[PDB]
Amino acid sequence: ATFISVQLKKTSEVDLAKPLVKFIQQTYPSGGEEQAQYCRAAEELSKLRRAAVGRPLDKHEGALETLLRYYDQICSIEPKFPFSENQICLTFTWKDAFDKGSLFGGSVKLALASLGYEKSCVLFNCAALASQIAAEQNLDNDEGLKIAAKHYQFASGAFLHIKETVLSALSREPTVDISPDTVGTLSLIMLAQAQEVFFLKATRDKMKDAIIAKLANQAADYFGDAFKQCQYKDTLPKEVFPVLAAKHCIMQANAEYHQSILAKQQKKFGEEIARLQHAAELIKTVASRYDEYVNVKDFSDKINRALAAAKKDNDFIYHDRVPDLKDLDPIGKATLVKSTPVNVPISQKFTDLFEKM
């Protein structure tokens, strides 16, 4: 399991309660117990922030739901408070997820007094934590596969939501980690890995090789587009580009290998050999170039066993001409994934703490 996940952004603790209570007793002049109800909700909301972003400890669904709930709560608050006009100043400080900084300028962090900044960074951590949960699923288990498929698509859609909204939501230029180009690439990586999970589910369920090949071919397209966005950039961690390049080639080889089984079933023995030769060449390229990052020894042996038997029998029995790769029909593509739209509420059983306001 060589899957890419994203580290969560860190933030400093903020007293969320104090500035909110001061600016509720001014629109609603009360003596307490009536608007003290809403004031208690602000204490709950400051507690919710500390729970959602204050202790990056575990990778279970309790932590994700807490982050999702905190995201829902924030989005539900910008309307009730006319924050387009300047009042209730609140600085959120977030560190870049990827840029370590140096010893000359400290870490890379940004402080902005804007709920758009906060909910962008919170949504980043929702997507990142979802990617970590997906990447740690047992993919030799149907429930692990299902969990990973759902979470990669969620992560893809949340990174994509950040891409489309982060610039208008902020008054400054964002840090690079949440900038449209970076989260656009993260979105496509999660989309690729979701497609890979569907391929692994089809393989595990022993679906028709025609379908497995189109699923792998689609995954190759996604991985290929992802690595092309990371060809000239060093934003993401070191291991992302070679893993993407390897997965692109591995998924093309899986497409060819499963298409070659279809060719054999149709008695197209020349074509089977041509496709196995292509798969072998791709896997040899991955083995020699990306060995530190993937383990293709078992897949290589499977291809070579198939190709040896294929050639032995074609030379001795069938004498099919082995077509050139250019003369083979393209393998189709089947996409089973989509970037999940972010439509608040994204957390379960959501109840807005400021609903009656």
């Binding site: 299902k146 498929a149 759902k150 569907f198 589910k201 679906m207 028709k208 379908i211 089947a334 089973l336």
Partner: peptide, 13 residues
């Protein structure tokens, strides 16, 4: 082929 990916999709929900 068409129905086989229908089931795949349905499994994910």
């Amino acid at each position: 082929e068409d129905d086989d990916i229908k089931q795949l999709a349905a499994w994910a929900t």
